[PDB]
Symmetry: C2
Subunit: 279 residues, 2 copies
């Protein structure tokens, strides 16, 4: 029997490369259901699958809207095997800019996808795992879920939310034999405008926004990992006989994380992060 894996958000980046990595593994032990919001974006996926010689029946695509629990329920029912051994919740959205420049619609959508979308997935798939006494849930995390990042207030909110969600569930799921883990990524190199931002906020906040964006570019140049490397961490977690709640894909944000975790008042972190970003 193959290990049946369902992965959300497979049109690009981590989900794309994880799907083809598992499907093309020399062992032939994985059957991957790769989900996508829009079927028209599936070409990159199929090209990658072809180039990696994924064997027949190792990779299937499904349409999946994580905002719609009927779409989630229909994806569950397409799993012909009647189980999911590994669930990877990876579909997510970013939102970058001054808080007072963000549309309420955009805030609500980022929450609905990143947080409520993950809830919907766990609601649909955890019951069969709990009754079976087995199953693995892997959640794409971020360094932005571990520490606050300026101009990513709502993004960090959504990723911090997953930390809380997963940790709460993990406490309960321990004796069920169902294992949940976050994969904490730093910057990843994958494949609204500045004018509206400036129109919705003060000229000085915009300058702070520019400075943040310049620091972030430099962080990416020093530290960006690719999706192939991140995929290997998902593999490590899914193979571990006794997985931990968090895996770190990189060691590079650990000095900052220590500053945060060694001063619960948050004073050391806020000053240090302010210095890191704005000099």
């Amino acid at each position: 029997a193959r290990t049946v894996v369902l992965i959300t958000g497979c049109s690009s980046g981590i989900g794309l490369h994880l799907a083809v990595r598992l499907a093309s593994d020399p062992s032939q032990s994985f059957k991957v259901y790769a989900t996508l919001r829009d079927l028209k974006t599936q070409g990159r996926l199929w090209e990658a699958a072809r180039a990696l010689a994924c064997p027949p029946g190792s990779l299937e695509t499904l349409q999946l809207d994580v905002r719609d629990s009927k779409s989630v329920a229909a994806a569950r029912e397409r799993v012909t095997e009647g189980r999911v051994d590994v669930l990877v919740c990876n579909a997510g959205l970013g939102l970058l800019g001054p808080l007072e420049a963000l549309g309420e619609d955009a805030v609500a959508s980022v929450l609905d996808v990143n947080v409520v979308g993950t809830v919907r997935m766990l609601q649909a798939f955890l019951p069969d795992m709990k009754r079976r006494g087995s199953g693995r849930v892997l959640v794409t995390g971020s360094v932005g879920g571990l520490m606050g990042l300026p101009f990513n207030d709502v993004y960090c909110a959504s990723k911090f939310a997953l930390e809380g969600l997963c940790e709460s569930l993990a406490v309960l799921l321990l004796p069920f034999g169902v294992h949940l883990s976050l994969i904490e990524c730093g910057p990843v190199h994958t494949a609204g405008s500045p004018e509206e931002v400036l129109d919705r906020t003060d000229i000085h906040t915009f300058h702070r926004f520019y400075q943040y964006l310049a620091h972030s570019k430099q962080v990416f140049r020093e530290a960006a990992q690719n999706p192939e490397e991140v995929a290997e961490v998902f593999l490590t977690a899914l193979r571990a006989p006794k997985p931990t709640l968090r895996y770190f894909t990189t060691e590079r944000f650990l000095p900052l994380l220590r500053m945060r975790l060694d001063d619960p008042s948050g004073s050391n972190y806020v000053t240090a992060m302010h210095r890191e970003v704005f000099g």
Copy 2:
């Protein structure tokens, strides 16, 4: 010139007691706009204010529903002084139960109130503070925003989210002269079995009973008076160099340390499972 304070969720609990504490302060330095979702619930607030002899004009009430940016905007227009010196984001919702037993609208509602509610408030009042170069934001946090609690999966997600929102903002607001702090509270003193059993498995149902039993006992041991919590808001409010996080109690600090000492989460999960379920 008085310190102008606007507080959300003042019909009871922390918001009520903080409003009356500031309004009745012997210094008389606070002008308090206490806001409530429905003004028809304002009785206990005003009865408390009268029992503490809050002077005329120390306290006003406004209707403010944090779920609606039109209501937030209209409340902002009522602040006659044309500034808020202290914004207290306090209105919040709980949600308790098996994840798979929770309705989608309840989940959406907790996030909308606890997270987007605070976003709405900050969007309305932060711009004037940033361009004045002064202002204090105080936000009601929870031990549930600092560590995951079983059967509070969505509640904890919403309080963790607040932590991330506020921390991100604090980093940016540092040079603008605007200071943001979270007030981390323990529990505060302020569906049928068959229906829950229908929506989950027998083993989860049993763990839920156990968590409810343990929680009853933590509450007797540890629940705080809202007066104490309000007093910690005032401590933070008057701090010369305010920090990001204040704790209202020492009780949960051992569990928190154990969480912070092991980033892998292995120590916390096992320890919290033992605390709750034996």
